[PDB]
Amino acid sequence: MKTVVFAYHDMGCLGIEALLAAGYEISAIFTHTDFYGSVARLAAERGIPVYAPDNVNHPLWVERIAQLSPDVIFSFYYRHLIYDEILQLAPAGAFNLHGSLLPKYRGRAPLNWVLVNGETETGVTLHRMVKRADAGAIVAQLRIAIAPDDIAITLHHKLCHAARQLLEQTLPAIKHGNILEIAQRENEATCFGRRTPDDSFLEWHKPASVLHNMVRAVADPWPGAFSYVGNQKFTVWSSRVHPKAQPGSVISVAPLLIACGDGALEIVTGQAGDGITMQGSQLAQTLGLVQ
């Protein structure tokens, strides 16, 4: 079975490796220019043509892809719209690997949003690509638990591991033909957009648990959850939730505890502005905080 692949990031790399292990002939890989693996380097190393146009929804690319005559198309964490004029070129269809328990968390950054929302589980889904983005029928879905101490990076590795497990068996299954797919129920779908810097802004009137989840959701290597001490921005890299004061006020400086709408949030590590990461107690002194 020959295929044209759209891929990026660790998921893109493992998807390409899985296709290769399943005997697919990858005619070309479409990716993006830039801690994760490089799909371009993997393609370059495997001798697979690789392209990184900013936008493929143009006849120039439709024709180039048509000439490659893919039987099937795969999208593994490609970040841009691949329009139907391209996807319809593959008689066996197009399939996308999405990092959530679809229909929940369609859209962008499901890895981060499930942590923001304090979900206790998430998963990977391989689904048919239809007109409507992330809504096509499910070939297979594999759930993973989210542990209280998972942060974006540890959950990312778990998702990649699940993706490897899922693809290892589903790719050969697709090679044998159409699989009876599971329809997504629109009434159960949720969709998220790309996260803006504002989406990681800590608002102290919220419950400490919610803020703690935000810290976990964008912990290093992600940008970090942030707030301000007056006009000084600071980032909270790691935190701890604790069980009678104005929200946002300092309860203690060592450890650094901030009163929230409910409970308190201990800033275990963080940084002031673009300064270096330090323990919360030191950050408190750096920011001029006092009980």
Partner 1 sequence: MRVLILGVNGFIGNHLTERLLREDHYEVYGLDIGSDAISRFLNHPHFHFVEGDISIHSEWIEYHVKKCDVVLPLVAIATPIEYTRNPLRVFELDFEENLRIIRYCVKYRKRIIFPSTSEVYGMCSDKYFDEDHSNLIVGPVNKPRWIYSVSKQLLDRVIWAYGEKEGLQFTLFRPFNWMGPRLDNLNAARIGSSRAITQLILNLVEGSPIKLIDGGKQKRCFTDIRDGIEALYRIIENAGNRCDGEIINIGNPENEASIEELGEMLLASFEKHPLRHHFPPFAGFRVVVEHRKPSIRNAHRCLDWEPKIDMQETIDETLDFFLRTVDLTD
Residues at the site binding its own copies, with contacts judged by CB under 8 A: 31, 33, 35, 38, 40-41, 43-52, 220, 237-238, 268-271, 274-279, 281-282
Q: Which residues bind partner 1 (CB under 8 A)?
A: 196, 288, 290
State the Cα–Cα distance between residues 216 and 61, nearest whole angstrom.
Answer: 39
Binding at 271: pick from partner 1, its own copies, none (beta carbon under 5-8 Å per type) = its own copies
- Residues forming a β-bridge with 267: 239, 256
- Please name the residues in contact with 232: beta carbons below 8 A apart, sequence gap of 6 or more: 272, 273, 287
Nearer to partner 1, 23 or 193 (CB): 193
Nearer to partner 1, 33 or 196 (CB): 196
Report which of 181, 186, 111 is spatially closest to residue 150, judged by C-alpha positions.
111
Residues in Cβ contact with 176 at an 8 Å cutoff, skipping those fewer than 6 apart:
none
Picked from partner 1, its own copies, none, the partner binding residue 209 (CB below 5 to 8 A depending on kind) is none
In the complex, what is the shortest distance from the CB of residue 74 to its own copies, in angstroms, rounded to a whole number?
18
Element (H, E) at 238: strand 232-242
Compare residues 276 and 290 and give the one whose CB is closer to partner 1. Answer: 290
Q: Which among partner 1, its own copies, none contacts residue 43 (Cβ within 5 to 8 A by kind)?
A: its own copies
Task: Report DSSP letters for 14-37, one per residue.
Answer: HHHHHHHHTT-EEEEEE-----PP
154 binds, among partner 1, its own copies, none (CB under 5 to 8 A by kind): none
CA distance 83 to 102: 20
282 binds, among partner 1, its own copies, none (CB under 5 to 8 A by kind): its own copies
CB of residue 195 vs partner 1: minimum separation in angstroms? 12
Q: Pick the closer one to its own copies by CB: 48 or 257.
A: 48
Q: How far is the CB of 21 from partner 1 (least distance, A)?
A: 37
Nearest CB to its own copies, comparing residues 105 and 237: 237
Q: What is the C-alpha to C-alpha distance for residues 202 and 21, in angstroms, rounded to an integer?
A: 44
- Nearest distance in Å: CB 230, partner 1: 8
Smallest distance from the beta carbon of 50 to its own copies, in angstroms?
A: 5
Least CB distance to partner 1 at residue 194 (A): 8
Question: How many CB atoms are located within 10 Å of the residue 132 CB?
Answer: 11
Which residue is listed with tokens 């689904």?
A: 127
What is the residue whose two structure tokens read 């990716």? 31
Q: Which does 187 bind (CB under 5 to 8 A by kind): partner 1, its own copies, none?
A: none
Q: Of 180 and 290, which has the nearer Cβ to partner 1?
A: 290
Minimum CB distance to its own copies, residue 288 (Å): 16
Residue type at position 105 = Y
Q: Name the binder of 51 from partner 1, its own copies, none, CB < 5-8 A by kind.
A: its own copies
- Within 10 Å of residue 1's Cβ, how many Cβ atoms? 15
DSSP, res 195 = P
- Residue whose tokens read 């319809």: 88
